[model samples]
Target: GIVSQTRNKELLDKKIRSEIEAIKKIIAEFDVVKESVNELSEKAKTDPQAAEKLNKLIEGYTYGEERKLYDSALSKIEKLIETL
Candidate 1:
């Protein structure tokens, strides 16, 4: 018979902490990426082809399962920029 594995509280806590740290690093990078994306988006406004390509890239991120926070932030930024 196969034995069931038990969860270790300390190990789980460490893992969660590690994930939080990783997310923090990701967020730091997101700021840079967001700024670049905004710059590109501004360029896209005068170029129809560039706008199409940028839209495709953003759509790709929105449809993906991972990085929803980053994607949502990007989407919101684009929308806000549009209104401005």
Candidate 2:
């Protein structure tokens, strides 16, 4: 009897679209967060403690190839937000 249940195709489609929109919003926010963090990192290079903190923050946020991107761009705005 359970196998004969009807599916709400419209509801499923709306839910999927909502999820996609949320993901797009998050990606846009990440662009801004990444830019600001990188700017802070560049300013911290002369301050050892600040630089250490930046390193830790970046480490917490990224891994593998993503980590490499953060490391390379963590010192300059052009490297992080140029394309944006």
Candidate 3:
């Protein structure tokens, strides 16, 4: 029974390690998306600065904005989304 219990513990550890690896992959995928958006925004013969601001909005999405809140920012969000 002790050997069987140890095996189960090892299995759990393996599963946990696998899921942690999956998390790493997910974050890596997001980094690629960020890079893609970066290139599109920067390379276009367009308002790269506006996209840069929208990029800030995304940073805000994850990290909380200041005062004006989502209400006023939605115009920028809408414009940026339509532009994209």
Candidate 4:
């Protein structure tokens, strides 16, 4: 149906944008996190407390937003899984 196709396209566009945004964010955050951890690790050798704090910070990392972005991308793909 026309409605179905239109809806699928809209969803696809949304998913694509969301996933792309997520990738961008993740890449940016990854660099920041990696650099921070590396710096802290180097400093932690002298100050053991820095290592503990870094461990706590890493343990707190969450993927809720990334999960949602992935779900959206998956759902959109599913919508087009069986092409007419």
Candidate 5:
């Protein structure tokens, strides 16, 4: 019984470690996305067409795609930053 319990604990630990690694990878990728979004936002400020296009894209999502999710979030952040 003791050996079985120890083995279960080890398996659980391994699962947690794997999930942690996955979370780390996701966060690193999001950091890259955030940087690019910020750069594009700055560029949009000086280029009305760029800003208009971004707004249009965010608002015109018909399929509810993955990119639309990111774009919508970025648009919200940009608006929040302006309010601050």
Candidate 6:
């Protein structure tokens, strides 16, 4: 009985598409958030604490890959969005 209780094909596909749309929207917003944060840091004239805090904020949002940097982040997100 439980084995027959699977999803409708159309509904499942629509839900998956919705999930992808939302992810793309958020990734787009991350670019906006990043630029503004860096702008604010520069506006602070590189106050040591302010710059460090802002730097870490972007770093943390970027999935802690401060080594390969946002370049890696961008590359990964792009392939998966295509992958999705």
TM-score of each: 0.50, 0.56, 0.47, 0.48, 0.48, 0.53
Worst 10 residues of 1 by lDDT: 1-10
Candidate 2, residues 1-84: lDDT per residue as tens digits?
A: 444333566668789899779867977999898898888788797888878878887666577566776666565646546667
Ten-residue region with minimum lDDT total, candidate 3 = 64-73
Q: Which window of ten consecutive residues has the lowest lDDT sum in model 4?
A: 58-67
**Residue pair clashes in candidate 1:** none
User: In candidate 4, which residue ranges exceed 4 Å CA deviation?
Assistant: 1-4, 53-84
Q: Residue 39's C-alpha lDDT in candidate 5? A: 76
**lDDT values, one for every candidate:** 0.78, 0.74, 0.74, 0.79, 0.79, 0.77
Model 3, runs deviating above 4 Å: 43-60, 63-84
Give the per-residue Cα lDDT of candidate 3 at 10. 100
Give the alpha carbon lDDT tens digit for every residue of 45-75 in model 4. Answer: 8998998976676555444555566678778
Q: Residue by residue across 1-84, what tens digits does model 3's lDDT show? A: 999999999999999899779867976897887887677666554877767776676787666673256556567758968998
Per-residue lDDT of candidate 1, residues 1-84 (tens digit) = 123223466677789899779968988998998898898889898988879978887876777544585677779868968999
Which should have the higher lDDT, number 2 or number 6? 6
The list of candidate 6 runs beyond 4 A from truth reads: 1-7, 44-46, 58-84
Decoy 2 TM-score against native: 0.56
Better of 4 and 6 by lDDT: 4
Q: List candidate 1 segments past 4 Å from native.
A: 1-7, 57-84
